[model samples]
Target: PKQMHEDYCFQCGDGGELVMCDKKDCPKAYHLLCLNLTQPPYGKWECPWHQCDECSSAAVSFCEFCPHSFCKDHEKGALVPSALEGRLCCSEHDPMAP
Candidate 1:
């Protein structure tokens, strides 16, 4: 899947004063000021993606039913809603939300 970054990405405003994190892994592509980090980190950078229990890859959300993990695509196919603060859920645990 394609990660959300910009080729010459800059903050929405600020006259290009704000920089975007050059990390290819971060889907957020957050503005440098938003992240409040120094350029390059001058060290090993890690994506903040969570681990998924199903595919064992970076997960976008988690399953409250079985306490498992799932990515954005996975959750779409198994779409459900629950009290997960806008996160994905499964029908098994999302019985309340129809």
Candidate 2:
């Protein structure tokens, strides 16, 4: 027909549908099957996360799209890269994400 996964099939490599990452940037789109996504990611998806090493807090804000953490004393802009530069989650696990 037209196009389904051209813009975002690197993760698939072989063939599959395109799914956007939870992050606003989408990481340029990837395949759900490739990443083993839950589909309809809305509110039910989180990329990866890391332990907040900034001053090494116990549990600070975490970026749902990446594995970087930030303490309350720090700003998200410091840890979050430009790709996914505007999201902030303070919990280890998202309520709606599965």
Candidate 3:
């Protein structure tokens, strides 16, 4: 994980109703509102990061169920392609499994 969970909101710097990343080693959390969402997603979810899985550039997408992030160039093979944008998952978390 490029960024660790902070006690305060990543956007507002506040700390209540914070949603944390499901990654075991990640310590990042965020408010739903700050994330522009009304609620959390089902099952496990990952937080956004600042670096790509194969490079140093800021990552453009996060794995749906892993502590990994990827830039557009690297995500072609790193993330599973799907019709649904949010359905993208890492090789470890097969998008068809569930």
Using Cα atoms with residue i matched to residue i, what is each candidate's TM-score against the true structure? 0.31, 0.31, 0.44
- How many clashes does each candidate structure show, in the order listed? 0, 0, 2
| Displacement of the residue 43 alpha carbon in candidate 1, Å | 21
Clash number for model 2?
0
Error of 1 at 61 (Å): 1.7
Per-candidate RMSD, Å: 9.9, 11.3, 12.7
Return model 2's CA RMSD, one decimal.
11.3
Between which residue pairs do clashes occur in model 3? 5-27, 5-28
Q: Write the residue-wise lDDT of candidate 2 on 1-98 in tens digits.
A: 65422464543344446654454433435567666676647664534332355666643565544344666776544533223334443344342441
| Candidate 2 structure, TM-score to reference | 0.31
Candidate 3, 1-98: lDDT as tens digits: 34656677654557888888776676767789877778877788765655686887778777654446788788777777544565777776656661
lDDT string, candidate 1, 1-98, tens digits: 55455443222323343343335554333345544666645454543335564576676764543334567667666645655565555554554551
lDDT of each: 0.48, 0.47, 0.69
Candidate with the larger lDDT of 1 and 3: 3
User: In candidate 2, which residue ranges exceed 4 Å CA deviation?
Assistant: 1-6, 13-16, 44-98
